[PDB]
RNA sequence: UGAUUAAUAGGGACGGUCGGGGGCAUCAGUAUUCAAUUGUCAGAGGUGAAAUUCUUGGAUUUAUUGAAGACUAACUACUGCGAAAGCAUUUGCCAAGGACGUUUUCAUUAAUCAAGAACGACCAUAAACUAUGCCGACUAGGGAUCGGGUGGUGUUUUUUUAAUGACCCACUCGGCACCUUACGAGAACUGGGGGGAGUAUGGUCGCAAGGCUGAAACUUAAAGGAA
């Protein structure tokens, strides 16, 4: 209700009407008769759904400009136990928000870790970067490894040569960590400890043994 | 726990918390003798036995004067001689508080046990 | 963990982002981010060997305005984490007495005046409970009562 | 662990709106037991149907003692019987479908609670020794 | 035929129920992958750039259709359930569990854990990684929330087919949590030396410098480094 006049001005410079319906709790954007841009209503759609997803307004009307886009990475369906899930998501946010703010700086994006999903705004190179970082953080590889690789790749992109060589000989994300392959006997574990549904009886007490 | 022990635990930590009334259920004759002798020496005030037919409740109104009650979980035997080494061993000072004994003439504090010259087993203390 | 450039950029990503590719490496950091990055690094290196009473000196701020700064800053912290927790937003974890570091902290430079936590409450928290005076030794005192060991019963009676 | 009981009242007399006789109540008890109800069901149908609060209060004694005086004593006591029939219902379901490991764990719990008051009823000897639980 | 209560200990019955508890069966969803039939035509993947790869035997895209395996998005919460590991489509069946309600029944049947018992020749895979708080026998609470119950009397409801509601307010019992409060001795899959940050070295153990190679017994080629 306080930021609404600024949404109305920011859309009326693009010729889009918009209403705020508090009796339902909705926001609609509508193409008017004077709307000469066809694809501006999709950016206004992103704008109202960002204001619903609780980004701020000055960070939200950076979506109405062409080099920017939304994304909502989905992380609810990566792992089974809630302890491991919340520890990997807090690993994504980081100690005192350091990992999240460093990723925001390196990818030029704006990230909100919320619930079991990770929203992001930003340029498209940054959006692909943050998507692979967030999904790799929900799998086991730490996000500071990806942040180190982002700093390495930034410094390799700001040199004129080395622009057509593969950078895998630079990156440390290649670690050669596949060093588990067991050689245990499976002496019982092939087919032993066969299942019954009925348990055996109990060992009775002393006074039960005397009665 | 026991059944005298938790009555004395309620009457301890309710007073340490600083309340003026404790409700303690279940009640028994051993609790009534124990509270009876400690109100004789003046560590609680009036106390009432509300009879419901299940086990009885006690409401103790208690002022400020107690700082520890309890029971002695091996109820060993004492004699009229060795009450003195026992009160010196488990009470805070020379003439500080009382040791409550289960005697042949009821439940009594140790000074009345030597005053009317009886012995018993130990039950608990109050100081 | 022993990459110094990485952890330095990680823990200085907040005031780089407050006072700004992006420039992060020294030989490229211009004024206020430079002075506070240097001050941050010198305090962090100094805290290992230097005395805790003398490494973090707070600015001499009067009572009625340091209490006012803290009250308004805690109202800002409460609004921030209450709004971000009534949304779904996951925030990084603080300890129990510490102020949460937010954008207004890094921007207003509030820790030099208000500190990281109210160390009076931290002191009277970290003190131990005053535990009366000890009375007896003849037995152990459990919730079932006073266990007097059988050696002690024989020894006394 | 919760606390939901019935509060047995402080009075131990007939409530004096009970205009009936204490003999017709015993005749009703033996009628319901002969037509085949467990003492809990006897007492609840008596409580709701014809307004006897509790038969120990209005009549002489508790209603398993009434059935023992009128020759209707239960073969196995009621608690042990109901846990027997529950344990064999779970064992029927388990022999039916053998991947209900939650039912197997519940069978373990029901069998232990069988054993506990089978032990109690054997050391009081309501039921005789060499009582095995099949 | 010939002694008590009926523990805000415990067990059992019953009543309306509650839940993403479990088992079997069934129903569904759009995705992904493959295939088939068209339509059209030179690209399509993918990357920081490329590449491997598919492609005028027509890839990718579009449309219709069919199958296979996996999963159950949004609703999804500091909420619910389970002894824990864990559990999200509908419907049915099978048993089970919980709290609540009770003027039902049994009458001490109980709590605790060493031991033990249950759960936890073929295609190959990750786990932890910044974290935290003062502990227990312990007092009041506060706002919210989930399940049950009692009362109040307004609106959504509605009526002569059988019931079953939703909301508001008070009370109450029990849960996963959260914010405060008051008061207490809180002692009697294994293998280990003892702080942090440094500083110095005629000891022990190793690495380590030379200096154009050729090229040394030979002052020796060709080719090269260096300037």
UniProtKB/Swiss-Prot annotation, chain A:
Q: Which GO terms describe its biological process?
A: endonucleolytic cleavage in ITS1 to separate SSU-rRNA from 5.8S rRNA and LSU-rRNA from tricistronic rRNA transcript (SSU-rRNA, 5.8S rRNA, LSU-rRNA); maturation of SSU-rRNA; ribosomal small subunit biogenesis; rRNA processing
Q: Give the principal location in a single coarse category.
A: nucleus
Q: What is the effect of changing residue 42 to S?
A: In temperature-sensitive mutant KRR1-18; grows normally at 25 degrees Celsius but fails to grow at 35 degrees Celsius
A GO MF label: RNA binding
Has the keyword rRNA processing been applied to this entry?
yes
Q: Which UniProt keywords apply?
A: Nucleus, Ribonucleoprotein, Ribosome biogenesis, RNA-binding, rRNA processing
Give the subcellular location.
Answer: Nucleus, Nucleolus
Q: Altering residue 154 to G: what's the impact? A: In temperature-sensitive mutant KRR1-18; grows normally at 25 degrees Celsius but fails to grow at 35 degrees Celsius
KW Transmembrane (keyword) present: no
What GO CC terms are in its UniProt record?
Answer: 90S preribosome; nucleolus; nucleoplasm; preribosome, small subunit precursor; small-subunit processome
What does changing residue 13 to N do? Answer: In temperature-sensitive mutant KRR1-17; grows normally at 25 degrees Celsius but fails to grow at 35 degrees Celsius
Indicate the segments forming the KH domain, all copies.
69-139
Its annotated function is as follows: Required for 40S ribosome biogenesis. Involved in nucleolar processing of pre-18S ribosomal RNA and ribosome assembly. Essential for vegetative growth.
Q: What family is it from?
A: Belongs to the KRR1 family.
Query: Which miscellaneous remark does the UniProt record hold?
Result: Present with 4340 molecules/cell in log phase SD medium.
Report the protein name in the record: KRR1 small subunit processome component
Q: What is the lineage of its organism?
A: Eukaryota, Fungi, Dikarya, Ascomycota, Saccharomycotina
Gene encoding the protein = KRR1
In terms of the whole protein, what range is present?
54 to 264 of 316
UniProtKB/Swiss-Prot annotation, chain B:
Q: What is its main location?
A: cytoplasm
The record ties this protein, via Gene3D superfamilies, to: 3.30.1370.30, 3.30.1490.10
Any one GO BP annotation for this protein: cytoplasmic translation
Q: Which cysteines are joined by disulfide bonds?
A: none
The record's listing under PROSITE patterns reads: RIBOSOMAL_S8 (PS00053)
Listed SUPFAM superfamilies:
Ribosomal protein S8
Keywords from UniProt, A to Z, are: Cytoplasm, Ribonucleoprotein, Ribosomal protein
How would you summarize the oligomeric state and partners of this protein?
Component of the small ribosomal subunit (SSU). Mature yeast ribosomes consist of a small (40S) and a large (60S) subunit. The 40S small subunit contains 1 molecule of ribosomal RNA (18S rRNA) and 33 different proteins (encoded by 57 genes). The large 60S subunit contains 3 rRNA molecules (25S, 5.8S and 5S rRNA) and 46 different proteins (encoded by 81 genes).
Q: What else is known?
A: Present with 19700 molecules/cell in log phase SD medium.
Q: What is this protein called?
A: Small ribosomal subunit protein uS8B
What organism is recorded for this protein?
Answer: Saccharomyces cerevisiae (strain ATCC 204508 / S288c) (Baker's yeast)
Curated annotation (Swiss-Prot), chain C:
List keywords of the entry alphabetically: Nucleus, Ribosome biogenesis
Please indicate if the UniProt record lists Nucleus as a keyword: yes
Name the domain of life. Answer: Eukaryota
| GO cellular-component term (any) | nucleolus
An example Gene Ontology biological process: maturation of SSU-rRNA from tricistronic rRNA transcript (SSU-rRNA, 5.8S rRNA, LSU-rRNA)
Q: Where in the cell is it found?
A: Nucleus, Nucleolus
The main location is nucleus
This chain's function reads: Required for pre-rRNA processing and 40S ribosomal subunit assembly. Seems to act in the processing of 35S rRNA at the A(0), A(1), and A(2) cleavage sites.
How it assembles, according to the record, is: Interacts with KRR1.
Q: What is this protein called?
A: Protein FAF1
| Section covered of the full-length record | 150 to 330 of 346
Swiss-Prot record, chain D:
The lineage's top-level taxon is Eukaryota
Gene that produces this protein = RPS13
TM region positions? none
Supply one GO molecular-function term: small ribosomal subunit rRNA binding
Oligomeric and partner information: Component of the small ribosomal subunit (SSU). Mature yeast ribosomes consist of a small (40S) and a large (60S) subunit. The 40S small subunit contains 1 molecule of ribosomal RNA (18S rRNA) and 33 different proteins (encoded by 57 genes). The large 60S subunit contains 3 rRNA molecules (25S, 5.8S and 5S rRNA) and 46 different proteins (encoded by 81 genes).
Q: Per its record, how is this protein called by name?
A: Small ribosomal subunit protein uS15
Function, as annotated, reads: Component of the ribosome, a large ribonucleoprotein complex responsible for the synthesis of proteins in the cell. The small ribosomal subunit (SSU) binds messenger RNAs (mRNAs) and translates the encoded message by selecting cognate aminoacyl-transfer RNA (tRNA) molecules. The large subunit (LSU) contains the ribosomal catalytic site termed the peptidyl transferase center (PTC), which catalyzes the formation of peptide bonds, thereby polymerizing the amino acids delivered by tRNAs into a polypeptide chain.
Where does the record put the Glycyl lysine isopeptide (Lys-Gly) (interchain with G-Cter in ubiquitin) cross-link? 31, 35
- Which controlled-vocabulary keywords does the entry list? Cytoplasm, Isopeptide bond, Phosphoprotein, Ribonucleoprotein, Ribosomal protein, Ubl conjugation
| GO biological process, alphabetically ordered | cytoplasmic translation; maturation of SSU-rRNA from tricistronic rRNA transcript (SSU-rRNA, 5.8S rRNA, LSU-rRNA)
């Amino acid at each position: 209700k306080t930021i609404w006049n600024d949404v109305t001005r920011a859309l009326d410079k693009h010729n889009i009407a918009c209403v705020l319906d508090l009796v339902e709790g909705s926001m609609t954007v509508k193409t008017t008769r004077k709307t000469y841009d066809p694809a501006i209503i999709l950016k206004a759609r992103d704008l109202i759904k960002l204001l619903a997803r609780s980004v701020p307004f000055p960070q939200a009307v950076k979506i109405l400009q062409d080099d920017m886009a939304c994304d909502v990475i989905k992380i609810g369906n990566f792992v089974t136990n809630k302890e491991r899930f919340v520890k990997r998501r807090q690993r994504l946010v980081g100690p005192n928000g350091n990992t999240l703010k460093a990723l925001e700086l390196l990818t030029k994006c704006y990230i909100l870790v919320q619930g079991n999903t990770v929203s992001a705004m930003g340029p498209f190179k940054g959006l692909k970067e943050v998507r692979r970082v967030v999904e790799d953080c929900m799998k086991n590889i730490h996000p500071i490894y990806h942040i180190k690789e982002l700093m390495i790749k930034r410094e390799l992109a700001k040199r004129p040569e080395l622009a057509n060589e593969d950078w895998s000989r630079f990156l440390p994300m290649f670690k050669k960590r596949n060093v588990a392959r067991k050689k245990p006997k499976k002496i019982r574990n092939v087919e032993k400890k066969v299942y019954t549904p009925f348990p055996p009886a109990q060992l009775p007490r002393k006074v039960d043994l005397e009665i | 726990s026991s059944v005298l022990a938790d009555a004395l635990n309620a009457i301890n930590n309710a007073e340490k918390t600083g309340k003026r009334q404790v409700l303690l259920r279940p009640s028994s004759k051993v609790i009534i003798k124990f509270l009876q002798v400690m109100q004789k020496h003046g560590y609680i005030g009036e106390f009432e036995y509300i009879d419901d037919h299940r086990s009885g409740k006690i409401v103790v109104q208690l002022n400020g004067r107690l700082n520890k009650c309890g029971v002695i979980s091996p109820r060993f035997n004492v004699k009229i001689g060795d009450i003195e080494k026992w009160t010196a061993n488990l009470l805070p000072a020379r003439q500080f508080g009382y040791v409550i004994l289960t005697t042949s003439a009821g439940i009594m504090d140790h000074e009345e046990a030597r005053r009317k010259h009886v012995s018993g087993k130990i039950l608990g203390f109050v100081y | 963990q022993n990459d110094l450039e990485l952890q330095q950029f990680l823990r200085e990503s907040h005031l780089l982002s407050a006072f700004n590719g992006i420039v992060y490496q020294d030989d490229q950091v211009i004024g206020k981010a430079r002075s506070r990055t240097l001050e941050m690094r010198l305090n962090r290196l100094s805290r290992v060997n230097g005395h805790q009473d003398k490494i973090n000196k707070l600015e001499k701020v009067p009572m009625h305005i340091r209490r006012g700064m803290i009250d308004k800053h805690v109202k800002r912290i409460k609004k921030y984490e209450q709004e971000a927790a009534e949304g779904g937003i996951v925030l990084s974890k603080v300890k129990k007495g510490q102020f949460r570091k937010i954008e207004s902290t890094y921007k207003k430079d509030i820790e030099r005046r208000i500190g990281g936590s109210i160390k009076a409450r931290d002191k009277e928290k970290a003190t131990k409970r005053e535990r009366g005076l000890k009375i007896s030794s003849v037995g152990r005192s459990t919730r079932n009562g006073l266990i007097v060991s059988k050696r002690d019963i024989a020894r006394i009676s | 662990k919760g606390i939901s009981s019935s509060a047995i009242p402080y009075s131990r007399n007939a409530p004096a709106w009970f205009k009936l006789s204490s003999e017709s109540v015993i005749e009703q008890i033996v009628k319901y037991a002969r037509k085949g109800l467990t003492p809990s069901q006897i007492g609840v149908l008596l409580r709701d149907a014809h307004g006897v609060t509790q038969a120990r209060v209005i009549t002489g004694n508790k209603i398993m003692r009434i059935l023992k005086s009128n020759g209707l004593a239960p073969e196995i006591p009621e608690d042990l019987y109901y846990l027997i029939k529950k344990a064999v219902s779970v064992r029927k379901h388990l022999e039916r479908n053998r991947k209900d490991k939650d039912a197997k764990f519940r069978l373990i719990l029901i069998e232990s609670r069988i054993h506990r008051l089978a032990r109690y009823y054997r050391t009081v000897a309501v039921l005789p020794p060499n009582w095995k639980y099949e």
